Design a protein around this ligand. Structure first.
Ligand SMILES: [K+]
Ligand SMILES: [Mg+2]
Ligand SMILES: [Zn+2]
Lengths: 140, 205, 133, 36
RNA sequence: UAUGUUAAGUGGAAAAGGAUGUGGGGUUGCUUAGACAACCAGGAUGUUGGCUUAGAAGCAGCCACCAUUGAAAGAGUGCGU
């Protein structure tokens, strides 16, 4: 009950970032030391490099913190098989890259525990949805 | 004016009436110009002048040039391409004295350079400035000349803003030119060109 | 709007009794502004109303001005006694009798037409009704 | 208060009411307060 | 006398225009397999959609505006940061 029970939901890359964009005023206002979380989160850098990982900060009844890892984002996993870094400016109207359903099969299994839908097929369409928004062409 | 509103206005939908006729404009306009660094001034476009202007019209003019007499900078635009420009310029100054424009920092911009082949587009010689209002390079250059005359009191300073008071980072992103943005564990450290007015507000940092 | 020339420089005011003999049904556009009561519409009022319609459409769709100011009217200056013959022509009017569709518009959706015409109607000295084909 | 013959909603939060047989619009935005 | 209307002393000066006044008609959508008003949950997930930007995480701005669990929830109606 003391301090804050509340949890702070953000996303950060593989390389430890002290700065403000994601963590700074998402950790500072919670009242953590930050650099401590630059000697912890690196446990989730060696395995998954380059791409981004949604982290869930959980400040309990005590002051201390315990990081809870999640599966990387959809649109971020949708730009390893597209050999690009930045997404498009005007989607559908003008696409930039092209991906294949074979790579979607992996991502449709890689995000299975997080997405509510219990089926193994519905989590293909919803990814082809994130593609339309991104701005790329798909082949089955 | 239209040039500097295309380039350096948050709302660039709003351009003034321009045409190749005598006395196209008759009413002052005022437009906010926000430089890419975030320095802010107002750019005001007035009635034109013409030789032997009736001593009755002159009494009315005084009301329009109320902003020019109260201006921080005065930009005198001459048509360099025309033969009678030294004639036009002196006739203008003589009128301004009658209107009551006194002791105001002046910049004699010579315009329509493109109409000539000899002269180059952007040049400066003190108050003298040669440029073409049609061209962007000319304006980017005129902008720099203004930034030299208005924002002199703008000097460099270092600040350390804890993460809890982010709002202050936003103020520095919006109301000052950031040179470098450094990030520490305790808070954010940002060094910028700010005004004396900001060096009272952010003094604690 | 002015007649290019006129047979006679001066002309009777005339009268505005009865429903307009013609131009009571929208014939070119989709929507029309029908006069409900009679009045002289000066050329200065027709221009005002035309620009007001046109500006709101943004060079979109068509505008027919179905009335033309055929009839001159004269005036006497201030400080001139009655007599010494008819005064000099001042302007041009269209005597609009009731039921006369004054403007018509096509090539914009109902809402914009209906809005264009109310803006036009506010410049005219006559009670108007918006009517469609 | 704007007191004018023509009292109309200026935004969509404007509401037209009657009090004491006067038409008025009331609104969150106090500039929009009108009475006929 | 009979049946209606008006609340303004309108009647017993005055227009453009403005309007949740009040009476009558006439079309028409939803509705006891439950409407409309309120009150009780829910209002999720991909996901901070992408670009843009110091930051833009439904909600400065531009471009899209798909699917998903089913009772259904906009790639978000207003505030707010
Ligand atoms: K009218
Ligand atoms: Mg001008
Ligand atoms: Zn309002």
């Amino acid at each position: 009950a003391k301090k804050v029970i509340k949890e702070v939901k953000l996303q950060i890359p593989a390389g430890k970032a002290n700065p403000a964009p994601p963590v700074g005023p998402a950790l500072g206002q919670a009242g953590v030391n930050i650099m401590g979380f630059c000697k912890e989160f690196n446990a989730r850098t060696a395995d998954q490099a380059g791409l981004i990982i949604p982290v869930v900060i959980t400040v309990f009844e005590d002051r201390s913190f315990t990081f809870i890892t999640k599966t990387p984002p959809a649109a971020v996993l949708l730009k390893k098989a597209a050999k690009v870094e930045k997404g498009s400016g005007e989607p559908n109207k003008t696409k930039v890259a092209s991906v294949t359903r074979a790579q979607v099969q992996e991502i449709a299994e890689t995000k299975m525990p997080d997405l509510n839908a219990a089926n193994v097929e519905s989590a293909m369409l919803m990814v082809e949805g994130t593609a339309r928004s991104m701005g790329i062409i798909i082949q089955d | 004016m239209n040039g500097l509103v295309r380039a350096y206005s948050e709302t660039a939908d709003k351009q003034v009436f321009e045409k190749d006729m005598l006395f196209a404009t008759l009413e002052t306009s005022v437009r906010e110009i926000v430089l890419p660094d975030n320095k802010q001034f107002l750019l005001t476009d007035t009635v034109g002048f013409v030789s032997k202007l009736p001593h009755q019209l002159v009494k009315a003019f005084r009301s329009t040039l109320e902003e020019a007499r109260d201006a921080d900078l005065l930009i005198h635009v001459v048509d360099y391409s025309d033969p009678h420009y030294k004639t036009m310029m002196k006739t203008t100054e003589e009128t301004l004295k009658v209107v009551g424009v006194e002791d105001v920092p002046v910049i004699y911009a010579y315009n329509k350079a493109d109409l000539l082949e000899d002269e180059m587009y952007p040049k400066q010689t003190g108050n003298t400035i040669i440029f073409s209002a049609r061209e962007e390079e000319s304006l980017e250059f005129l902008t720099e000349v203004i930034r030299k005359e208005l924002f002199a009191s703008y000097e460099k300073a270092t600040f350390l803003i804890p993460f809890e008071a982010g709002q202050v980072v936003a103020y520095l992103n919006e109301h000052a030119d950031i040179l470098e943005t450094e990030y520490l564990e305790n808070g954010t450290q940002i060094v910028a060109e700010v005004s004396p007015a900001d060096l009272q507000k952010l003094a604690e940092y | 709007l002015v007649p290019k020339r006129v047979k006679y420089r001066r002309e009777f005011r005339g009268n505005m009794r009865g429903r307009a003999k013609g131009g009571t049904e929208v014939a070119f556009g989709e929507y029309g502004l029908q006069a409900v009561e009679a009045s002289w519409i000066t050329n200065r009022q027709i221009e005002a109303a035309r620009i007001a319609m046109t500006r709101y459409m943004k060079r979109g769709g068509k505008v027919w001005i179905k009335i033309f100011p055929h009839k001159s009217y004269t005036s006497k200056p201030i400080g001139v006694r009655m007599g010494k013959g008819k005064g000099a022509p001042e302007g041009w009017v269209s005597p609009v009798k009731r039921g006369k569709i004054m403007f018509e518009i096509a090539g914009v959706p109902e809402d914009v037409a209906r809005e264009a015409l109310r803006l036009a109607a506010h410049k005219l000295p006559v009670k108007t009704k918006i009517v469609k084909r | 208060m704007k007191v004018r013959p023509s009292v109309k909603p200026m935004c969509e939060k404007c509401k037209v009411i009657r009090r004491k047989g006067k038409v008025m619009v009331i609104c969150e935005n106090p500039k929009h307060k009108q009475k006929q």
